[PDB]
Structure formats: C-alpha cells, structure tokens
Amino acid sequence: SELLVNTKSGKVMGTRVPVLSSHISAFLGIPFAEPPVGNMRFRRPEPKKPWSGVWNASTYPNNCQQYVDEQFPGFSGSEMWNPNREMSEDCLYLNIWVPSPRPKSTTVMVWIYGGGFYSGSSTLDVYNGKYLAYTEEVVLVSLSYRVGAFGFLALHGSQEAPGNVGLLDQRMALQWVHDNIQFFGGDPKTVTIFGESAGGASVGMHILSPGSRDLFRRAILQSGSPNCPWASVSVAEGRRRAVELGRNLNCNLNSDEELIHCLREKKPQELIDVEWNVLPFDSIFRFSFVPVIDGEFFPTSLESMLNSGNFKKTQILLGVNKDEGSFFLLYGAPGFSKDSESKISREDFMSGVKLSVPHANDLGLDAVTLQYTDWMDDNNGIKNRDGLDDIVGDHNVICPLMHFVNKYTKFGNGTYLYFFNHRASNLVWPEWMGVIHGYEIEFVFGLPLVKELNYTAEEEALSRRIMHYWATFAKTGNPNEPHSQESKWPLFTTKEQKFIDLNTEPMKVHQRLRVQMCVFWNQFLPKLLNAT
Amino acid sequence: SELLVNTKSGKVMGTRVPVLSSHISAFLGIPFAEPPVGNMRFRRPEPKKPWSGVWNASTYPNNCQQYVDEQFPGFSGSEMWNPNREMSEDCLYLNIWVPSPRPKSTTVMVWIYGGGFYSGSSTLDVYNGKYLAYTEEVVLVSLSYRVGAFGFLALHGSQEAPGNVGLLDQRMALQWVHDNIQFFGGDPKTVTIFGESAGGASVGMHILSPGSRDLFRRAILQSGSPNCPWASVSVAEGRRRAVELGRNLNCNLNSDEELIHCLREKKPQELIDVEWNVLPFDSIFRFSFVPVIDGEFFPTSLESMLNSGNFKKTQILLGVNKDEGSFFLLYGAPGFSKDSESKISREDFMSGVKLSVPHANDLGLDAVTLQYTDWMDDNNGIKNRDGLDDIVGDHNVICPLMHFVNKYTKFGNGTYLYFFNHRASNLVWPEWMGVIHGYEIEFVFGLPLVKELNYTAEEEALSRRIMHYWATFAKTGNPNEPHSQESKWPLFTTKEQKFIDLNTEPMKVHQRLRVQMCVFWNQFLPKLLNAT
Ligand SMILES: O=C(Nc1cc(COCc2cn(CCNC3=c4ccccc4=NC4CCCCC34)nn2)ccn1)Nc1cccc2c1[C@H]1CCCCN1C2=O
Ligand SMILES: O=C(Nc1cc(COCc2cn(CCNC3=c4ccccc4=NC4CCCCC34)nn2)ccn1)Nc1cccc2c1[C@H]1CCCCN1C2=O
Ligand SMILES: *[C@@H]1O[C@H](CO)[C@@H](O)[C@H](O)[C@H]1NC(C)=O
Ligand SMILES: *[C@@H]1O[C@H](CO)[C@@H](O)[C@H](O)[C@H]1NC(C)=O
Ligand SMILES: *[C@@H]1O[C@H](CO)[C@@H](O)[C@H](O)[C@H]1NC(C)=O
Ligand SMILES: *[C@@H]1O[C@H](CO)[C@@H](O)[C@H](O)[C@H]1NC(C)=O
Ligand SMILES: [Cl-]
Ligand SMILES: [Cl-]
Ligand SMILES: [Cl-]
Ligand SMILES: [Cl-]
Ligand SMILES: [Cl-]
C-alpha cells in the first residue's frame, strides 16, 4: 500500500529495503522517457507513453551504454564506478527512496551522476540513496541520462542529432519529478538538484538554460561546474568530432542524413570502440562527446550568460576536493607508474604539462611550467609530481568552479563554498593520490554509517555533518540550523569570499580559495592564449 | 722625489697625503686626453699631447658636465653623489694612489665610476682610493669619462658624433695605465678594472669589446652588467634620441653635420636641461645617452657575443646588493612620498610597474604584476612597496647580472659571485630602503676604517674582509688566500651556481641567486614580448 503509487504515467509498485536496523521504501527503475532506440538514437527524448497495469519497480534498471574502465580489472577502487547492471540503450529510468511512513510533502533531492559525460550509472553502490533518505527524511531521486555519442553527438542544424540530448534526458527526469513527486510524498516546489563532476557541470548547465530553470528550487555542485574546459565544445568542434566518428566507421560523410543513418546502424559497442579517436589532441581530462553551446539549450556563450546574469537566481552550495587531478595522471601519464610513489622526472613533468593543457601554444606551456616549477629544486620528483597534480586539478576543476562561484554570487541569492580535504581511513588508492576526485561522494551518501564498511567514528560523524548540511540546505537554502550552538558555515560573498573546510577537525573559515593560481588560470593564461 | 715621476706623457708632481696613522703618495688630476672641448665635443678622445715641465698633480681635477641631483638639497645621502669639484668639459683626468715607499711592481686596480652614464665623478669622498691602496698595498687608479650627451650622443655613420666616446675615454685611460703605471710601481700585466652600476656595465663592456681586452688582466663588476636593459641602445634609437635632442634645442635637423654643429654651439647646461626629454617612455631606471650597439666597439649584439664566447676569457668577481631598486622608486614613483614608510596602494603599485617595465605591452605588464602580487593580500601597502622594490632591482640589476654570470662562466676561467646584504649602522636613508644601490662602495673603499665616520667595529672588519677579497682577487684571480684557515669563497660553476653573502655574520654559501624571478625576467618575459 505504502509501496503502491499512482502516477501521471501509470501505477508503480516499489519494495521495502533495510537500512540501518530500520526500513524505507524504494521505487527502482521507473521509466521517464521512451527507450531512445532504433531511429530514436541521438534524438531528443520523448515522454514515456503511459502504461496500463503495475510497473514492477523493485529492481535497478539497466545502465546506459558506455566505455567500461578496465585499467585495473577487479580493483574495487576503479570497479566501484563501472556499470553494475547490464548496459543497454534502453536506460532512461529513475530511482526514488522514500522515508517510511511516507511524508506528506518533504524536501526532494535529485542526484545527477558524473563520469565525464561518457560514463556513469545511477545504480552504483556509492549512490545508494537509502542512507540519506532515511537519516535526513528526504525523498531522494537518482536520474539517468545518455552518455557518450548516444547522449552528445552534435550535428547542429540537424533535428535528428542536434546535440545535448543527454542534458534533455536529465531535464525530462526533472519534469517527471515536477509532475509526480508529490505522489511519493515529495514537495515539487522544494527540489534540489545535486551532482558530482560531470553531474556538477550538469547542475550548473540547468541553472543557465532557460528551459530547465523552473524544474528545481536550488542546486548543489560537487567538483564540477558548467564552464569547465572539458564540459562543452563549440558547434563546429562537435560537428568535426561527429564527422570524424563516421570516418572511423567508414560511413558516408556526404550529408548529416547519411552520416546519422550510418551511425544508427552500428551496434553500441561499435561506437564506443572508436569514441576516443575523435579528440583533437592527446590529452587527459578531455572527453569526446559533451554538451554543445548550441544557441538553444544555451542561448549564448557561457561567459556572456554569467557576465549578464542570464541564469536562475537562487541559493547554491558547491565545492571541491583537495586532489582532483591525481587519478587522471595515474591513468593517463605514463611517468606516474615508473615509481611506487609516482615521483616523476623533469622530462615527464614537461610531457604531462603538454597532455594536461592540450589547447595551449608553446608560450602558454612555458607559462604553466614556470608557474608550477620550483626552480631552486626542479629535479625533485615529489615536487614535480605535486606540481602536475595541482595543474590538472586547478585547470579542470578548482579554478573553473571559482570562476563560476564569483560570477554567480554577483546575482544569486546565497552561496556556500566548501573545500573537502579528508582522506578516508579505508581508502584503497595509494596515499600520494590524496583526496581523490569523487571520494567526498561516499560521505554525502552516508556510507560511513555502515559499521561493516570500516570507517572510523570520526568519519561517521563527518558523514552525518555533511548529510545534514546538504539536506538542511536543500530544505531551507542555508546549510546551517540557526538557533543551534554549532559553528556556522558563512555565506560566500563577493567581498570576503569565505569558505569552510570539510574534514574531521573543528570548522575553519578561510577566504579566496586558491586565488593565486586561479588568477593565473582564469585571467592571465586566457589573455596570453588570446594574444598569440 | 717619491712624488716626482717621469711618464711617457711628461713629468708629474704628486703630493703626500695622510691615511689613517700613516701617509701615502697621491697623483691627482693627471690628464690622459686632449680636452674634448669646442670642435672636439662628441668626438672620440685624442691622446694628451706630451707636456714640457712638471705637471702639478696635487689637487683633484674638474668633474665632467652632468645633471646635478637637487631632489634633497643639502641631504648628505644624495649630495655625496654630486660633483664636489667644478664641472667642465675639460674633465678627462685620472688619479693614482701609490703606497709609500713606492712598490716595485704591485697589483693595479682601476676604478670606473657609475651614475647611469649621465653622471658620476672620480673625486667623490666615497671613491677616495687611499685606504684601499694603503691597506692592501695596491696601486689604485680612478679614471673619468664623459657622461650624458657629451659622452654618448650617437649619430652612427658620422665621425663627428659616432657614439660610445665615453667608453673610448675609459679605454684611453686604460691605455695610459698600460703604458705608464710601471713608473708608479704598478704592474701593467696585473691590472683589474672594477666599477659599480654603469661602471660595472662599463667593465663588462671592455670584457666584450675587442679593442679593450688587452688593456687589463681581470674584472670586478658591482651591481651592474653590460647587458642591463638601461645600459645600451640600438643605433636607430641612439639616432632618434640625438635628433630629438636637436629638436628640443631648435637645431637644424637636415643632416648630421648641421645638427652636430648646432649642438656644439650650445652651452653644456643647455644640453643637460633637455637631456631627459628624449626618452621614449615615462620610466624609471632609464637614461637618455648610453652606449650604442654599433658594430665597432661591439661587433655584434651583446647576446650573440655572450652566446659565442666572443669576449675576454679570464676571472671575474661580481655581485649585487639586496635592495637595488629602492632609491629609484623614491625618486621617480610619487607613491613613495605619500606615506612615511612608503606603503603603496594597489593603484600606485600598478603605475610603478608601468614606469618600471616601460617597454612591455599590456600582456607583459600583467605577467609582471601576477609574478609579484600576493593575491591573498593585494591591498597590503608593505607587500606592494616591497614587490615593486623587487621588480626594479630584479629587472634592472640582479637578473641581467645573473644572465651575464651564467653566459660568461661557460667560457671563462673563474667566476666568484656575491650578494651584499649589510645595512650600514650609520645610514641616513630610511630603513625600508634596505641595502641601497651603491652602498657597498664605502666598504670596498675602506671608509669604515675611519673612526670619525661612526661605523661599528664589526663593519670595519667587514670592510677589511672585502678589501682583502677584492685585492687578493686582483692579485691572483682568486679572492681566497691559499693556505688560510678561513672559510673559502667557492667558485661559481654552471652546475652548482654557488655564491656567498657579504655581511657581518659568518660566511654562508647559497646556490642559484634569485633563480625563480630571474627565470621570469631572463627567459619567460623576453619570450612573451618577442612573441606578442
Ligand atoms: O584515449 C583515451 N582517453 C581516455 C580517457 C579516460 C579518462 O581517464 C580518466 C577517467 C576515468 N574515468 C572513469 C573512472 N571513474 C571514476 C574514478 C575512477 C578512479 C578514481 C576516481 C574516480 N572518480 C570518478 C568520479 C567520477 C566518476 C568517475 C570517476 N573517468 N575519467 C578514460 C578512457 N580513455 N583512452 C584510451 C583510448 C585508447 C586506449 C586507451 C585509452 C585509455 C583508457 C584508460 C587509460 C588507458 N587507456 C588505453 O589504453
Ligand atoms: O625622468 C625620468 N628619470 C629621471 C631620473 C632622475 C634621476 O633618478 C634616478 C637616479 C638618480 N641618480 C643620481 C643619484 N646618485 C646615486 C644615488 C643617490 C641616492 C641613493 C643611492 C645612489 N646610488 C648611486 C649609485 C650610483 C651612483 C649614483 C648613485 N642616479 N639615478 C632624474 C631626472 N629624471 N624618467 C622619466 C622620464 C619621463 C617621464 C617620467 C620619468 C619619471 C621620473 C620622474 C617622475 C615619474 N616619471 C615620469 O613621468
Ligand atoms: C517484481 O520483481 C521482483 C524481482 O524480479 C520479484 O521478486 C517480484 O515478485 C516481482 N513482482 C511481480 C512480478 O509482481
Ligand atoms: C535573498 O533574497 C531575498 C528576497 O529578495 C533578500 O531579502 C535576501 O537579502 C537575499 N539574500 C541573499 C543572501 O542574497
Ligand atoms: C700645485 O697646485 C696647488 C693648487 O693650486 C697649489 O696650492 C700648489 O702650491 C701647487 N704646487 C706647485 C705649483 O708646485
Ligand atoms: C683556468 O685555466 C687553466 C689553464 O687552462 C686551467 O687549468 C684551469 O682549470 C682553469 N680554471 C677555471 C676555473 O676555469
Ligand atoms: Cl543497433
Ligand atoms: Cl599529496
Ligand atoms: Cl561506525
Ligand atoms: Cl567537530
Ligand atoms: Cl660652449
């Protein structure tokens, strides 16, 4: 009865799941779009046709087709991010966790997974929504969206492969939540969208895009922002990559209709096998098929939108991890496995700089090199490793986010900024990698509350603190409970630019998160590359 | 009799002067050139015609015509650098201090004064050679040379005003020493030239110039080097400045002969009154009439000469002071007078950067600003002052010298590098100015040995140490006394790049003198300006 819900698309039947010696309701694999298959591959999503009968929503759905990571077969640290369900183009489903008994109209949080817009699943163990839903009494939704060429092949002008359809998949799940979440006890007027990495970029993209703004109340962005250098391409570059993808499969390249028709007849794994070939350079933290600045989903360039205040004005909470770049270098820079601690020579540093800033001319490479080299000690393998670590994280995550946060805060209605710098006591990655891209997620989702996962008592308390900040922000637009005695997370303002650390120590307030390097990345280096 | 010397130019009569608790011989105002007056203005020097009778060399000669500093009238700190004798175009004389009794063939040191190539005198109290000559038993010579337009007006292709004649004055005094110093007890095979600021650039220029190399044995350069950005100009820029000097004086500009003839009719002070007007930019640490890269004194560009080893190969000793920039900012950046300790707003920082790197485009100015700004704390008046202080000293003095050191050491026969960072206990300048441009000279010349000047006894010991380093280097090409128990001043090498501090504390060896900023000034910013 609790598990039986009549929606505007049909009746659904959920399942009762255990969580921390109690139970809650889960509705898994609810369809929100027509399967984007056959002649609908690369097309805008269509609403799911209402069904008769009872949709069985007790099991996780398929994951979208995607490149599977085989760098470290069997290693939990990488396997925890891979699809744990069968892959299929039939993947546009959402999941809902509902406190029990069902609330009347409580706060809703909607998760958007990351994965560079080429990978990701709503069904990962680390996205299990039951702990956050139970502990904070929120309705927790996780959506899905098409990735890779299936989500972001962009032949602008064509209505058959317009680009950005994976962003429209997300918007369609948000529309479904808007129309139906009230029947699961959720308040459609108090929906917070949150996501990490490409999920965080996505969240920012919905803040910008006029067509998405009314489908949510406020936003949380983790280690990602819409202006990230890897998160979008021009319509020309998207067109170039789509054609290059056809060339890699010996397709007729004479017309969009011919190219698209050829691509629609390849098996999914055939597109995935060639996906990495269309990139313009050898590079790390670059992805083949990503959103396009199309003049439709994004009316103008992201910078002009940010400059003019052309975005949803609300409250945002956002932040970064200390070592965003480490796993990208381990995976993509060969020098990082010549040494057990990944100390690297000066030659490998220079090579890595080229791989990490692939768009820079030779003068920009020197500028990057000079900014991150200790010329008193340039053969120090540790300083070389750490310098290139910072380059990757600053360029791709931290400084784009700081640019976004300063532009947004001029027009928005409240900004809260964090710096997550706790290394989990049970981490399986080597210590030099630090606080890795993605490893705040398990704290946000409450995993340290599970005794058998072997976190410390301090880490359970940190997880509880973070979940409550997140939910209280979702509920009120402010992560703090005023009237409490706890330390207060202060607003980020244009003038004082305050942020807090998130770790196991008592709260610290700082100002101007990595301002020195982000002036280099956000102001000086683009001016240098614009000059030459 | 000891005071009577027969030279190849005629007999000279010197004077016995007291030094400390003893006495020494001095031969003051010996002419080495025909007075460059009348039609000889701007012309290459001519050897002094031998005289009959006895030249009375018992008093200091006139100083050359020059801009007199009146910024702080009566203030000892600035007046100690102004002419203390009458100014005259009849100024090509030299001074010699000779130990008593006369040595048979002792080490010779020849002093070349600085002053931006637009000022300077051989007769300043701080250049009194008697202490060094007495204490170290060397024959000490100080020369003079024409400064300003008189010495460096350059209309290339003209034989009436060819440029570089002030350097040819220096060379002709060196030739006089070569021909005659044996008659004063000096060894002409063991002559060291040394000078500070423009005198140090000059010393460097005789190392480069083939017509000078055989007139000295080894070289000492203090706070100056031949490649400094203020120390030379192209022939085109020298010609532009000379023409602009005529324009300022309503001269006929139709030809070199007419321009020169007009210029030769003006009183010296009329040239000096308009000297600063020919500079191409508003600037500090830039001077109007300086050596020209002419293809004769300098056969090719300084950089190509340095790169190919086209220079005298011998031993050099050289170094810099801690705060080369400070008095240039006091004099020329009005922000340094708004506040007692010269705290500097951000606006005045940015203006000073423009004044200090006047040749840079906007991208280069931003590069400089970024490199010297603490963006966590950009309104700190102390940090802004110190940052602009370091900009001026690094750009104009320290990093040019480091570039010269590294090029020279690839081909030379022994390099010794120092960093002078003692602030005299009796300094009359405010504390923020630190170790000022020129204030190591008084230690080199042994003024702390004079009790009436209220130096500390530890500063006397430091002066004695430096005089002994300098003279021992002049005598042997190594500042260290062999078979000694003191710590050794190490050779500077391409690989280890060692230098010492000069101060009252025990000797410390360091490596890579200001390498971080000098990579910026010597490698990156030039590449940036060349490319953009
Ligand atoms: O040319 C290319 N480029 C290319 C670039 C990548 C991007 O590598 C970084 C990356 C990886 N992932 C998914 C992992 N998931 C996550 C984590 C995983 C570990 C730790 C933290 C994590 N945090 C996460 C947070 C967010 C979620 C996702 C997270 N995302 N980004 C991948 C593949 N190919 N590949 C190519 C082409 C031809 C041959 C080869 C290769 C490459 C294939 C791989 C190297 C060896 N290769 C070949 O032999
Ligand atoms: O007008 C100029 N420059 C300019 C520079 C001066 C002289 O200032 C530096 C100087 C002075 N001295 C003789 C002192 N003797 C010494 C010391 C004296 C004190 C402490 C240590 C000492 N150590 C010594 C070691 C060596 C020997 C000599 C030493 N030498 N250098 C005069 C006039 N004009 N640039 C320019 C051009 C166009 C527009 C603008 C500007 C600027 C400047 C005007 C405001 C903003 N500006 C513009 O709008
Ligand atoms: C729904 O699916 C689950 C898992 O396959 C199954 O246990 C349950 O009985 C199903 N309910 C139906 C088919 O009514
Ligand atoms: C948010 O908006 C309300 C309504 O205009 C305003 O009163 C409040 O000051 C704003 N707060 C912030 C932090 O911008
Ligand atoms: C040398 O010149 C000085 C200064 O005019 C003078 O006092 C001295 O008597 C002269 N000595 C001679 C002419 O022998
Ligand atoms: C100086 O030259 C001599 C002669 O070739 C050589 O033996 C000596 O090693 C050189 N010293 C330096 C420091 O270059
Ligand atoms: Cl198919
Ligand atoms: Cl680290
Ligand atoms: Cl626990
Ligand atoms: Cl705490
Ligand atoms: Cl005259």
Swiss-Prot record, chains A, B:
One of its GO terms (molecular function) is acetylcholinesterase activity. It is an enzyme of class 3 (hydrolase). It catalyses: acetylcholine + H2O = choline + acetate + H(+). Changing S197V: Loss of activity. Disulfide bonds join C64-C91, C251-C262, C399-C518. The keyword Cell membrane applies. Changing E196H: Loss of activity. SUPFAM superfamilies: alpha/beta-Hydrolases. Inhibited by substrate concentrations above 0.5 mM. Changing H422Q: Almost no loss of activity. Keywords: Cell membrane, Disulfide bond, Glycoprotein, GPI-anchor, Hydrolase, Lipoprotein, Membrane, Neurotransmitter degradation, Serine esterase, Signal, Synapse. The active site is at S197 (acyl-ester intermediate), E324 (charge relay system), H437 (charge relay system). Its EC number is 3.1.1.7. Found in the synapses and to a lower extent in extrajunctional areas of muscle and nerve, and on erythrocyte membranes. It comes from the Eukaryota. This is Acetylcholinesterase. It comes from Tetronarce californica (Pacific electric ray).
